[PDB]
């Protein structure tokens, strides 16, 4: 090359090829339909939980502790045909994550909680 106008030699940019995409490294099936049964585990049936179904609108579940609030809402749509407007998660001193899940006021909380059965 030529026309060196700076006091030091910085590296010229050669042509640089992209990396190949590998075919696979995992040989295991992963069903996208069962994938929200691990998000939502089971509902609580305690006294503070029963009060919030009736008085506010909310449902309460133990969920897995490594889910965010966005993927809990999407599992409360595919399992249960309801619309979550607000999830308030809580990692308990037991070690489990508990979510308070408020429904969209087009969906009754007791009508969902009878279909689940609690």
């Amino acid at each position: 090359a030529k026309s060196y106008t700076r006091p030091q030699f910085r590296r010229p940019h050669t042509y640089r090829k992209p990396a190949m995409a590998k075919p696979s490294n995992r040989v295991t099936v992963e069903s996208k339909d069962i994938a929200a049964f691990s998000v939502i585990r089971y509902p609580l049936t305690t006294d503070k939980a029963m009060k919030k179904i009736e008085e506010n609108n909310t449902l309460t579940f133990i969920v897995d502790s490594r889910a965010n609030k966005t993927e809990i809402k999407k599992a409360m749509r595919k399992l249960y045909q309801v619309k979550a407007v607000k999830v308030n998660t809580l990692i308990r001193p037991d070690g489990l994550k508990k979510a308070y899940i408020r429904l969209s006021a087009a969906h009754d909380a007791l009508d969902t909680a009878n279909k689940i059965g609690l």
């Binding site: 026309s3 060196y4 006091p7 030699f9």
Partner: protein, 220 residues
Amino acid sequence: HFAARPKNFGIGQDVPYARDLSRFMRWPTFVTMQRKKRVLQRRLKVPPALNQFTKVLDRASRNEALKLIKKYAPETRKARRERLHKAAEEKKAPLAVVTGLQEVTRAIEKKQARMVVIANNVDPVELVLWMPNLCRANKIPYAIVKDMARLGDAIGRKTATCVAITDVNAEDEATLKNLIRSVNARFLSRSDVIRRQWGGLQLSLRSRAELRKKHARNAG
């Protein structure tokens, strides 16, 4: 309104154009020490055995030589895979220059080569450092040409340290013998000069100009 606005490039004036800082820049370490390796071989006093590789056969005798090494180059892989698959049918090497540091050496110990062509810049220089004195002890005409890329181009390689010419065809036989007289003028008949000519001891251009102006002021 196409008027001219000249920029003043005095000291302290308008900020200048981008210069060529190529001669004052920090280069990479391999290029700043392959350039100081070339100075250091020039500034130091070189023994007459490495001086002789800086003394090279000229262009008219080199361009005559490698064009004769070109036409007697070894046959390639296809030209050697054929003539053998066309001779396994006969039960069902035409002529070339001697190339290689083990083969050219044998062509002088046997005194079979009629001319040897030595390169000047093999990277461990001890490979062909002994090579002109073997041709001198056995009285084969030799050459040191400006090559090792141009010898390998003539014979189909990337690099050749030495090429020997054992024999040619009689068409270019006067051409082979005119080249031997052209090359003994430079190397073999001039052997007593080559053995005792200590080279090196050149100065800078910058140090040399400090002998002009250091003597032109003490000129009286």
